[PDB]
Structure 1
Amino acid sequence: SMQEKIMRELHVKPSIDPKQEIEDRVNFLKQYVKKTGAKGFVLGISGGQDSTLAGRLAQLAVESIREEGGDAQFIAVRLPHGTQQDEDDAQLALKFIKPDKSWKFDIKSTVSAFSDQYQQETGDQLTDFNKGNVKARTRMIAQYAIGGQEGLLVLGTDHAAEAVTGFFTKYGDGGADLLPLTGLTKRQGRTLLKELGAPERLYLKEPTADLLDEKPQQSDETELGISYDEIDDYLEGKEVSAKVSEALEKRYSMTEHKRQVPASMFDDWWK
């Protein structure tokens, strides 16, 4: 069964124990830190559900490590491109996460320098969509710069509901060192945030990439054409309409390249 295969590959559990999931994921963060001797984590905080959840998990892991006598820190970073329309949500997220450190890095001048150079070098102007991907990749650079400067690992917010659609920028937000949210569907992530006591605003808002200058705050569902609820039912193994299966299985096959290391002639997944 395709549904069954996609579920196993994305590590989705049809039924979770919220409390245990948090314990498991915080323990994963701690184990990884100890194994690598890293000093902690850095994660861009957007004000959206995913980074809010990953952020809180990283803070809990770091506090748990210190409590045991270890040394670890967590730097949450605001990465606006100029003014962020929902900056207030990002600030709310920070108030909830309570990170050790809250930094900010405005990516606008870097993206502008890039775009200008692009037009200068090719005579062409970057399309809104392509510039959006430059923004996502510039955020990865900003996080790795901070991680490299301070000796921290970069957390990624990828989870099953976005992995299934390849709904992330290759080497942009998809570029991270570890993924604490792997296998969680969108509603399961929301369940974890409720368990953690997060303000409802953070999980009630519409998921957005917010990468376009022409259409800022464009909802994921708008670009995708499927709702997160249909995506989650599928991932959780619920019998869904053939229209959902067909759309998702098609999207999954086309984005396999985003879930694998660069392709070589010795790889079969692409044939």
Structure 2
Amino acid sequence: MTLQEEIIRQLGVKASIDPQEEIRKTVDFLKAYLRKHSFLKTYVLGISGGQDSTLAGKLAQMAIAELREETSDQAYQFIAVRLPYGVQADEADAQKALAFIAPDQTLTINIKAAVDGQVEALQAAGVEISDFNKGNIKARQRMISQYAIAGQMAGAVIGTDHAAENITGFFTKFGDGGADILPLFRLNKRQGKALLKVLGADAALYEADEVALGVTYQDIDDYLEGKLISKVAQATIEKWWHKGQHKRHLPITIFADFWK
């Protein structure tokens, strides 16, 4: 068994998908999860204007709407959350995402006072905080904001993690990685695009990451589909895989092996 095969098995990626089926599978998964947890009424999701949160958000809103029609229980709601740090660069992709989703409720929680208070408290203790580090603070503050809403509104927090991020460990641990349920887990990036095409999403919702990673989504996706890619791209992917193992396992106990 190659490393590639073993990664493909862990992440559950199919070489190709039926989009419509995958839509249905996800919606039913999201409904089943709610039906089993009878005290839960809401799904909560940060909406960034990016492909992942747009798709997940849409799938969640559909699950709620159907479940509400099925049960006649109006307390079922999807809560979209906007989480800008200060005055957000372009709210335009977000606006389109929200329009497409048509969410039951939208809340805007500005994380800037919280993030700034955190950084000030660090700095006052003599801890300088880099841009990267601040970035992780923001992602983790968004986790807090979403869990706070969920604690008040009988909610489960939706995570946007999917196979193309997971293989690369391209998320903040206990940040955007911090969530209850992962509707998009098993899908690679292009597979996400396909689902959005089938849902009729504005083409602008799915057209730096790759430069940060040193590898393209084309390559990541192809690797996840069991295809052969260049050696340099393979080594890059495999670097990220090994590096991100701790993000992909539970906290390390004395009985753990994977890190040894």
TM-score, normalised via structure 1 length: 0.93
The aligned residue for residue 127 of structure 2 is 124
Q: 1:233 aligns with which of 208, 215, 222?
A: 222
The aligned residue for residue 52 of structure 2 is 50
Write the letter of the residue equivalent to 1:125.
E
| Structure 2 contact 46–83 (Cα < 8 Å) conserved | yes
Q: 1:244 aligns with which of 233, 239, 243?
A: 233
Q: Which consecutive segments of 4 or more residues in structure 1 shift more than 2 A?
A: none
The aligned residue for residue 209 of structure 1 is none
1:77-226 aligned at under 5 Å gives the runs: 77-121=81-125, 123-204=126-207, 219-226=208-215
Count, aligned residues: 256
Q: What do residues 28-53 of structure 1 show as CA deviations (whole Å, max 9, x unaligned)?
A: 00000111121120000000000000
Whole-Å separation in 2 of the counterparts to 1:260 and 1:120:
34
Write the letter of the residue equivalent to 1:140.
M
Q: What do residues 67-97 of structure 1 show as CA deviations (whole Å, max 9, x unaligned)?
A: 1115311100000001221211101100000
Whole-Å separation in 1 of the counterparts to 2:237 and 2:7:
10
Whole-Å separation in 2 of the counterparts to 1:70 and 1:5:
44
Whole-Å separation in 2 of the counterparts to 1:137 and 1:103:
18
Write the letter of the residue equivalent to 1:77.
V
Whole-Å separation in 1 of the counterparts to 2:90 and 2:220:
25
The aligned residue for residue 248 of structure 2 is 259
Matched, 1:59 2:48: no
| Structure 2 contact 159–182 (Cα < 8 Å) conserved | yes
Q: What do residues 110-155 of structure 1 show as CA deviations (whole Å, max 9, x unaligned)?
A: 001111111112x232111111100000000000000001101000
| Long gaps (5+) in structure 1 | 205-218
Q: Supply the RMSD in Å over aligned alpha carbons.
A: 0.9
| Structure 1 contact 47–86 (Cα < 8 Å) conserved | no
TM-score, normalised via structure 2 length: 0.97
Q: What do residues 222-244 of structure 1 show as CA deviations (whole Å, max 9, x unaligned)?
A: 21110111100000111111222
| Long gaps (5+) in structure 2 | none
Q: Match of 2:45, SS?
A: strand
Whole-Å separation in 1 of the counterparts to 2:185 and 2:161:
6
The aligned residue for residue 11 of structure 2 is 10
The aligned residue for residue 80 of structure 2 is 76
The aligned residue for residue 39 of structure 1 is 41
Q: Match of 1:68, SS?
A: helix
Write the letter of the residue equivalent to 1:252.
W
